[PDB]
């Protein structure tokens, strides 16, 4: 007991010493020689209306045109973002959904929430109506995030401090990822879908291996609950948004926090974090009813998106980086270009 | 006009979906949303009987459809999902009176702490909290043998059911820091009482009238 605790403390001290030794420089002082991105002026191009309650999640399609969103009224609406047309409207058994995912193929969608159940709905049914394809159960906490990894299996994170890779065909937990001491609130799958970072309420994020099932890395430095997480487009780094008004960019290779994005004028939490196509801009939704676009390489706030009258709960960027869709608690979605 | 036949038909489908969603929202607007809270086995199951992570119970009483959501067994960070219940019409907070003399720290102390946290948080700054004091018969039975001084050392009253119940209700209501905007409805029940649904009906009727006044630009 005491000896094991001392050994764990020594291992943590060794980790900190190695991180300090490998930190010969900092990203802020390295990217001082590159020109700033200037002022990002994004004007809302599309405004999606039809949700009767606070929108809690959205997910872009791989075609950069379809957009799924979930609301607390019990509705999962799939939009044609180009024409603002409601492609689909799925009534959900539980109205307490706080996450939703869009399959890379587009044939399926996912949702989950306080029901501790991940519902996967088939969009390409021969009957022409979107019926629930699978009902994954086994999580003892609220489903906070879910991300599709191909059609057959899906990665989810729950409020019982655990993540799970489920095989949709069999409905059983293929892999269980445990070790977070707080409720996992966000997920992000790597572009190759071999690793994924999950941030929890323990003020920490964990890089997990899908195939191995073991915790590859652990990242610390946030002062409060991490609500958002997102990989860099390169896949060698990720960004986390937490309850304290600061985003943090960590690098997997360096196992360290590269950058901190914070302003004294912001004292509100962060609900969503996403990157642009090139990763130069980091877009974070805040509780001040506004989104902030920071220069990820220079930590300078490039611009502000101030079209939402309520808390910006969910945010996403298309696969081609053409537009950014932000859904807020005002029951509206806004697509900016 | 700039739209093809398939595009126009898709627009028509979107309009039909809009109409269906508007009808669903109108139907759900008149429903009475209730959030059931408690410190444990205080009587939430007993209240649900006479009226996974989230348990939804829908029942119709006097032409009002109540949807009561029970969050018992969630066992996770409560602060991470209370904001989902911001629009809930009323909160039924159940407290076991007989748990005054029991301990896990006193059980009633934990119940009072939970009541203070729920009532005084930002998401329920104006949501009405109807309070149920279950196991009143057990409380009356064990109040003569177990004085309230164990739970409330400041109780200067006698070992009488009426005085002790009034003191406990006053102590629970004193935790409200927004008495001007939030009203706490206190009711006493023992087992399978048919007046619980009537009391909830009256409380939610008052809440609905106040909300209609607020939504009409009149309050």
């Amino acid at each position, epitope marked *: 007991l005491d000896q094991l605790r001392q050994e764990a403390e020594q291992l943590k001290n060794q980790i900190r010493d190695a991180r300090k030794a490998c930190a010969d420089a900092t990203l802020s002082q390295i990217t001082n020689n590159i020109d700033p991105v200037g002022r990002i002026q994004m004007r809302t191009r599309r405004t999606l209306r039809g949700h009767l309650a606070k929108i809690y999640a959205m997910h872009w399609g791989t075609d950069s045109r379809l957009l799924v969103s979930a609301s607390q009224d019990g509705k999962l609406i799939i939009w044609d973002s180009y024409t603002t047309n409601k492609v689909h409207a799925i009534p959900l058994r539980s109205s307490w959904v706080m996450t939703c995912a869009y399959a890379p193929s587009g044939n399926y969608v996912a949702c989950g929430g306080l029901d501790n159940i991940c519902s996967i709905y088939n969009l*390409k049914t021969r*009957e*022409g109506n979107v019926r629930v394809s699978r009902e994954l159960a086994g999580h003892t906490g609220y489903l906070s995030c879910c991300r599709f990894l191909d059609d057959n299996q899906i990665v989810t994170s729950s409020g019982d401090t655990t993540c799970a890779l489920w095989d949709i065909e069999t409905g059983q937990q293929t892999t269980t990822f445990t070790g977070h001491t707080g409720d996992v609130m966000s997920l992000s799958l790597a572009p190759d879908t071999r690793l994924f970072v999950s941030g929890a309420c323990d003020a920490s994020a964990k890089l997990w291996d899908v195939r191995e099932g073991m915790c590859r890395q652990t990242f610390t430095g946030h002062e409060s609950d991490i609500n958002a997480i997102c990989f860099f487009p390169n896949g060698n780094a990720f960004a986390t948004g937490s309850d304290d008004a600061t985003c943090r960019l960590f690098d997997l290779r360096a196992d360290q926090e590269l950058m901190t994005y914070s302003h004294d004028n912001i004292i509100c939490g962060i609900t969503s974090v996403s990157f642009s196509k090139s990763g130069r801009l980091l877009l974070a939704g805040y509780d001040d009813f506004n989104c902030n676009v920071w220069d990820a390489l220079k930590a300078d706030r490039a611009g502000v998106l101030a079209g939402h009258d309520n808390r910006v709960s969910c945010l996403g960027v298309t696969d081609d980086g053409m537009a950014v869709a932000t859904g807020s608690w005002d029951s509206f979605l806004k697509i900016w270009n | 006009c700039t739209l093809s036949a*398939e595009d126009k038909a898709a627009v*028509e489908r979107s309009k*039909m979906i809009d109409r269906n969603l508007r009808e669903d929202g109108e139907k759900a607007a008149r429903e009475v949303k209730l959030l059931l809270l408690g410190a444990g086995e205080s009587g939430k199951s007993t209240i649900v009987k006479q009226m996974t992570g989230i348990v939804e119970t829908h029942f119709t009483f006097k032409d009002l459809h109540f949807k009561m959501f029970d969050v018992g067994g969630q066992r996770s960070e409560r602060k991470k999902w209370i904001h989902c219940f911001e629009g809930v019409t009323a909160i039924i907070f159940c407290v076991a009176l007989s748990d005054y003399d029991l301990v896990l720290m006193n059980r009633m102390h934990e119940s009072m702490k939970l009541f203070d946290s729920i009532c005084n948080n930002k998401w329920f700054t104006d949501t009405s909290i109807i309070l149920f004091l279950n196991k009143k018969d057990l409380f009356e039975e064990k109040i003569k043998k177990s004085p309230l001084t164990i739970c409330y050392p400041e109780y200067a009253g006698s070992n009488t059911y009426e005085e002790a119940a009034a003191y406990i209700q006053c102590q629970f209501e004193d935790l409200n820091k927004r008495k001007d905007t939030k009203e706490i409805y206190t009711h006493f029940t023992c087992a399978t009482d048919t007046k619980n649904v009537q009391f909830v009906f009256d409380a939610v009727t008052d809440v609905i009238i106040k909300n209609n006044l607020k939504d009409c630009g009149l309050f």
Partner: single-chain antibody
Amino acid sequence: DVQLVESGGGLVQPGGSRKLSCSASGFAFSSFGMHWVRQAPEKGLEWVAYISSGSGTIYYADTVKGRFTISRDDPKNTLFLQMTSLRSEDTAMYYCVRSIYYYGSSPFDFWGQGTTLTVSSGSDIVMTQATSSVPVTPGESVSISCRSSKSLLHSNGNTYLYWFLQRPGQSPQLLIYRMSNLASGVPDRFSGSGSGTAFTLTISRLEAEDVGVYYCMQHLEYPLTFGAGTKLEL
């Protein structure tokens, strides 16, 4: 699973009235648009009418407008076509065609069995088939060419061309929708290409299961017109 069973056909004297019915099963009939399509004993180029989901929009062919009427009953999942003052040109087989409309949808995917009705004794875009009978051999590649009076490509980047295959004794089935997309259940042997006006359907490794008449249809304009029908022999 999905089924559209037609009834009400037979022999009708000229000038009479007949109500064809199409009972739907295995799918959500309420959310699906329904077309009535006419296959003449020789031509099969005629599209009768169309009703949208919820009966919001109803369209008729120029030959049948003011004479035929198309209605739907969602609770019983039925499609009705009432025809008054029937003419000798209406002697044909009628099909009720399932057709949903959203982004990425597959309209005209399923066709009904059809009922035979026999009557006793200019601005519309036209689609033309480059050939009528094509002698083919199994295992080879066959190209079916079609032409259009007006470009089928729209300002949204969608070319609204549909390739259907009708087997002998079977209702037409959707092979290609929007000139490039394979319908569900259709083998990958079929491919579609075009440049807005001229289109080609290519079949690789032909078998005996895809021998029949190939029809091309446009959906750019509300009056839906079909091609003459390229028939494959042997």
